[PDB]
Amino acid sequence: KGEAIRIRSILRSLIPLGDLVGVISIAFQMPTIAKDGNVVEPDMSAGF
Amino acid sequence: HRTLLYGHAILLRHSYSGMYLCCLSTSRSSTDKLAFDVGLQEDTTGEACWWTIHPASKQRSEGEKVRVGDDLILVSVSSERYLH
């Protein structure tokens, strides 16, 4: 379908594959156990 | 001898070179990113060489004749982009 090919080309040109690969490669912040035997947890709503 | 009507797809041929206006796949990449370049190519195959006329202002409508003094906007068939 010409329309489908056109839309796919538009999206491919808009978003490069390398940008997606890099964003996926971006790492997270693991929860960490600390002294007193309790975990400190990064906030869901304030981070990646 | 078709007469041009707002809505047709036209074939603009260069008088000197004999080649046809088209939206080239390659782009100069001067931060346009989502845009192409307009040039000339020999082959009429494909929808790159074809351009659709659209009215400029509200007075002109789709399906009426093209006048000499009227303004128009050309849309590439392949790249759905305007001459800019």
Write structural notes for this entry:
This is part of a larger assembly, with two copies of chain A. Chain A is mainly α. Chain A is 46% helix and 8% strand. Chain A has a two-stranded antiparallel sheet with strand order 1-2. The longest helix of chain A has 13 residues, at 2-14. Chain A is rod-shaped. Chain A: This is Ryanodine receptor 2.
Keywords:
part of a larger assembly; 2 chains; 48 residues; mainly alpha; two-stranded antiparallel ribbon; 2 helices; Ryanodine receptor 2 (chain A)
Which helices and strands, and how do they pair?
This is part of a larger assembly, with 2 copies of chain A.
Chain A: H1 2-14, H2 17-25, E1 32-33, E2 39-40
Antiparallel strand pairs in A: 1-2
Helix content, binned percent of chain A: 40-55%
Secondary structural class of chain A: mainly alpha
DSSP helical segment count of chain A? 2
N-to-C order of helices and strands of chain A: HHEE
Q: In one word, what is the shape of chain A?
A: rod-shaped
- Biggest interface, and residues per chain? A-B, 5 and 5 residues
Overall number of strands of chain A:
2
Q: Kindly provide the radius of gyration of chain A, computed on alpha-carbon positions and rounded to a whole number of angstroms.
A: 20 Å
How much strand content do the residues of chain A show? 5-15%
Largest sheet of chain A: 2 strands, antiparallel
Oligomer: part of a larger assembly
- Side by side, the strands of the main sheet of chain A go 1-2
**Ends of chain A: how far apart?**
38 Å
Organism (chain A): Homo sapiens (Human)
Protein name (chain A): Ryanodine receptor 2
Subcellular location (chain A): Sarcoplasmic reticulum membrane
Family (chain A): Belongs to the ryanodine receptor (TC 1.A.3.1) family. RYR2 subfamily.
